[PDB]
């Protein structure tokens, strides 16, 4: 058991959750032996939001709000006995967690990404090694191609929106030879120091590889776009014998009245309707309720939402926690 895994915190963590953060297709695919050398460093209250996710062992250490990813590794660098598998908590993807770290051993990358089809990524012929990635924070002029990249690799597929998954596999070689060179923070923007060609990291070529997946969408920090709409594997709940949901995320101990059926919807724990909860296409979170006339159609009913007795709201981020009784909310998002 050598190479270890760590969890990050933020970007732009646990916001769009009805009842469960469905990071479970990570934690159902490869946790039989699995996933033992894992470290929680995320958003003391952080030691109480993962006693429900059935992990075998854990290391829950806090880092400060100024989340330099490089500072997040500088804090627990000595307890990195071996290599790093940074998988942030800002992740939902179902993709196969073995081949994404089997391309880690192809020509043994010092650093291995995983991306998914403005923010450019270049790549070689065979979809194996990315050469330079770039976002707009280093390009006000267009882009530069050097001599040697083109004089050696003549066929270069470019990309411009092939968005990240945040699966970074990582070898201790470059974190030694770049960590103490403190002028490179932001490990997402450390990839622009690939630092390979004739231009320190290579402290003496370097190996980097990514895998372009083709199955799910990217991670979500504050969406639940297809994450409330994520087919988890109803599962174990109870109903008023008529909750016809579209395999719907029914949080159990629900207070169903007359045909409360939040179809295509995350009806969370105590997702109460004393009347017809119809197909919401929404997410009615924990301790949220549209009772006695559920007008449930697209209204994002977030953490302890309150809109009921004609919950007139659609196509918006509806009221997250704020008490709005006769909420005639609109296409614009309801108040915080």
């Amino acid at each position: 058991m050598e190479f270890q895994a760590v969890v990050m915190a933020v970007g732009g963590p646990l916001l769009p959750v009805g009842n469960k953060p469905l990071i479970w297709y990570p934690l159902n695919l490869l946790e039989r032996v699995g996933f033992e050398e894992v470290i929680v460093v995320t958003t003391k209250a952080l030691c109480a939001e993962f006693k429900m996710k059935m992990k075998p062992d854990i290391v829950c250490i806090p880092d400060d709000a100024d989340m330099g990813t490089a500072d997040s590794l500088r804090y627990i660098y000595p307890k990195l006995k071996t290599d790093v598998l940074v998988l942030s908590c800002d992740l939902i993807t179902d993709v196969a967690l073995h081949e994404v770290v089997d391309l880690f051993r192809a020509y043994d990358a010092s650093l291995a990404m995983l991306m998914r089809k403005r923010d450019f990524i270049g790549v070689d012929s065979t979809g194996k090694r990315l050469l330079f990635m770039a976002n707009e924070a280093d390009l006000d002029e267009e882009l530069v191609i050097k001599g040697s990249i083109l004089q050696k690799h003549p066929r270069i597929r470019f990309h411009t929106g092939l968005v990240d998954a945040h699966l970074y596999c990582l070898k201790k070689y470059i974190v030694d030879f770049l960590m103490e060179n403190g002028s490179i923070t932001s490990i997402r923007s450390e990839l622009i120091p690939y630092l390979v060609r004739k231009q320190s990291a290579s402290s003496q070529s370097l190996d980097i590889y990514s895998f372009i997946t083709l199955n799910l969408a990217p991670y979500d920090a504050c969406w639940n776009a297809c994450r409330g709409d994520r087919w988890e594997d109803s599962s174990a709940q109870i109903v008023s014998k008529h909750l016809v949901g579209v395999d719907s995320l029914i949080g159990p101990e629900t207070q169903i009245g007359e045909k409360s059926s939040i179809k295509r919807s995350v009806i969370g724990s105590s997702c109460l309707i004393k009347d017809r909860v119809t197909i919401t296409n929404c997410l009615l979170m924990n301790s949220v309720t549209v009772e006695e006339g559920s007008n449930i159609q697209g209204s994002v009913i977030c953490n302890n939402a309150v809109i009921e007795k004609g919950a007139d709201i659609k196509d918006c981020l509806i009221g997250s926690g704020q008490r709005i009784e006769a909420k005639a909310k609109r296409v614009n998002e309801v108040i915080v």
Binding site: E142, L143, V144, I145, K146, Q151, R155, F158, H159
Partner: protein, 421 residues
């Protein structure tokens, strides 16, 4: 739809000197036959009945040389359109003539008289024609231009081409040349339009081949600010997009400088262009019919080999030739009538008509011309050129560069011959 072509002689962004004085830039005998016959049997190799060759330079010469071919008479599938020397400058007034005289319906081949190749062109011709029929004539042309490496003798830095292009629907983006640039930069505004991706390709050498349907007569005579084809297609690529096809096997390249003369004269006998290989006797020249033999030598008729003259790679002789003893000749061509005497060492000599070499003479990496009584110990080195009746003597040696002739200002020589410096 019948298939014709125009065949320009010479773009005067000039690189040939002083060989373009008595004979032209286009009657350049690569293996003892005129280069017009090589490019013309490229145009007869693929199927084109009628083509237009334009002449500007001493109509008496090309007139007389086109009086003794066998497609002088249209018994074969060609007769040749030739015209005489009024106001002609370069390809500019050629295309202004071809839409003023208006000898064009659709889809003709634009080649210089300076490309030798073996592309049977018709494949991408019909793919281009499908692209015309299907999509409303937004695609102007299609250029076919080779796949190669970043390292080749034909991709010397004068016509080095990088293009950026998609690979699904193969329409180009940047025709950015590289005569001296080494940092590369592509304007990023045209990558958000194709977010699935876009390749870049450097595996290219331009065959100077491409087809043209007379939309470009409109986009050429309207826009006077384009004259050569390169700034033309860049102006096409800034405003009508133009397409691309990457051929896989067969090739040709334009014999621009003498660097390409060396590479092509060492490739027709390394034989990368068969059917073209000069045993075929394209002319009715019984003074050219030569006999192939093992390891690519080509003895002429009444060859008169010198005793012990060993031959290894890619040589010739001519008719009426007398070669002397002790010749270690490799990768060369020799011309007819040559009284090349005894103990004359050669290596990649490109010797032409009427020469009589004197005995005991290394010659190396040279190309020389008619009626040259060359004499003792004229040792040379790469990129050396003698030309047209000037006579050197007992070891007037020459270094790397040699712009010499018999004419006074271009040469390194006055009125008389090069006997004394």
């Amino acid at each position: 739809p019948p298939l014709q072509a125009v065949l320009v002689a010479d773009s005067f962004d000039r690189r040939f000197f002083p060989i373009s004085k008595d004979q032209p830039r286009v009657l350049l005998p690569l293996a003892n036959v005129a280069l017009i016959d090589y490019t013309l049997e490229f145009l007869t190799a693929t199927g084109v009945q009628e083509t237009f060759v334009f002449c500007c330079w001493k109509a008496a010469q090309i007139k007389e040389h086109l009086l003794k071919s066998k497609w002088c008479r249209p018994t074969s599938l060609n007769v040749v359109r030739i015209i005489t020397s009024e106001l002609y400058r370069s390809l500019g007034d050629v295309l202004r003539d071809v839409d003023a005289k208006a000898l064009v319906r659709s889809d003709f081949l634009l080649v210089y008289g300076d490309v030798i190749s073996n592309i049977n062109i018709t494949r991408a011709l019909e793919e281009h024609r499908l692209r015309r029929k299907l999509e409303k004539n937004v695609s102007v042309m299609t250029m076919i231009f080779k796949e190669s490496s970043p390292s080749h003798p034909t991709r010397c830095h004068e016509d080095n081409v990088v293009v950026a292009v998609d690979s699904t629907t193969n329409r180009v983006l940047h025709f950015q040349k590289t005569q001296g640039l080494r940092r590369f930069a592509f304007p990023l505004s045209l990558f958000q339009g194709s977010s699935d991706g876009v390749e870049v390709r450097y595996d290219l050498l331009d065959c100077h081949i491409s087809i043209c349907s007379p939309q470009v007569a409109q986009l050429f005579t309207d826009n006077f600010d384009y004259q050569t084809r390169d700034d033309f297609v860049r102006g096409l690529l800034v405003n009508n997009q133009i397409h691309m096809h990457v051929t896989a096997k067969e090739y040709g390249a334009r014999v621009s400088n003498l660097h390409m003369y060396s590479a092509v004269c060492a490739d027709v006998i390394r034989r990368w262009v068969y059917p073209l290989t000069p045993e075929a006797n394209f002319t009715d020249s019984t003074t050219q019919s030569c006999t192939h033999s093992r390891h690519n030598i080509y003895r002429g008729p009444e060859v008169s080999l010198g005793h012990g003259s060993i031959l290894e790679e890619n040589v010739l002789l001519g008719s009426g030739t007398v070669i002397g003893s002790n010749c270690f000749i490799t990768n060369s061509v020799i011309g007819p009538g040559c009284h090349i005497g005894d103990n004359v060492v050669l290596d990649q000599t490109y010797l032409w008509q009427g020469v009589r070499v004197a005995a005991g003479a290394q010659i190396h990496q040279s190309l020389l011309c008619d009626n040259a009584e060359v004499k003792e110990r004229v040792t040379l080195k790469p990129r050396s050129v003698l030309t047209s009746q000037v006579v050197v003597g007992p070891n007037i040696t020459l270094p790397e560069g040699s712009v010499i002739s018999l004419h006074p200002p271009d040469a390194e020589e006055d009125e008389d011959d090069g006997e004394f410096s």
